[PDB]
């Protein structure tokens, strides 16, 4: 579940340049989302000055 | 001969060590800049010296690449530093200078 691990990745997906590409493109899609939200939340925590205040003013529309 | 000559000789030895080509197993003549006179002298070298010169340059470029240097015992020692090119270079220059004198008349 470790030597055979990168071995499977190579066997099932990296051998052909076909899959290799398909995997990084499928891998670019998910990663974008995970990095975006994941980094927004880090930018979110170190702050709390912007639109956390929204709950007040709005709603009264 | 005495105190003074040794002092100029030790200053020369000092520069040599500071110059640091020795550290890459190079000899002084391996560092000469290649102009025509020099390109010709290299050409005129005998088989053995020519082959040794390429191996030295190769050994150095390789070292220079990984920014390493030779163990201290393999540094070339000053004045054990054979100036193999000099006599050839000298003659090539002498030949050029004669052409030049003839070109004036």
């Amino acid at each position: 579940v470790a030597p055979t691990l990168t071995a499977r990745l190579y066997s099932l997906l990296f051998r052909r340049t076909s899959t290799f590409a398909l995997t990084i493109v499928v891998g670019a899609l998910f990663f974008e989302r995970a990095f975006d939200q994941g980094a927004d939340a880090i930018y979110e925590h170190i702050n709390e000055g912007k639109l956390w205040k929204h709950i007040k003013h709005k709603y009264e529309n | 001969v005495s105190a003074s000559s040794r002092w100029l000789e030790g200053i020369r030895k000092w520069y040599y060590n500071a110059a640091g080509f020795n550290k890459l197993g190079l000899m002084r003549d391996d560092t000469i800049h290649e102009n025509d006179d020099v390109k010709e002298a290299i050409r005129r070298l005998p088989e053995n010296l020519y082959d040794d010169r390429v191996f030295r340059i190769k050994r150095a470029l390789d070292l220079s690449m990984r920014q390493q240097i030779l163990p201290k015992e393999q540094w070339t020692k000053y004045e054990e530093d054979k100036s193999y090119l000099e006599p050839y270079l000298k003659e090539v220059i002498r030949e050029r200078k004669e052409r030049e004198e003839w070109a004036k008349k």
Binding site: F35, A39, D40, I42, Y43, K50 | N48, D51, D52, F55, K58, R59, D62, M65, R66
Partner: protein, 48 residues
């Protein structure tokens, strides 16, 4: 004076995280390819 102020620092945060991931990786890619040269061993074998 600088309305973009916040958004820029959010991108800048992301620029630092991306770089911190990308920098080592590209470095390892390049070292892997330079391997062949770094460990190359030379030998001189003249006649006689």
């Amino acid at each position: 004076a600088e309305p973009e102020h916040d958004h820029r620092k959010r991108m800048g945060l992301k620029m630092l995280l991306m770089m911190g991931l990308l920098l080592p990786l590209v470095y390892a890619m390049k070292r892997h390819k330079w391997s062949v040269l770094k460990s190359r061993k030379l030998a001189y074998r003249p006649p006689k």
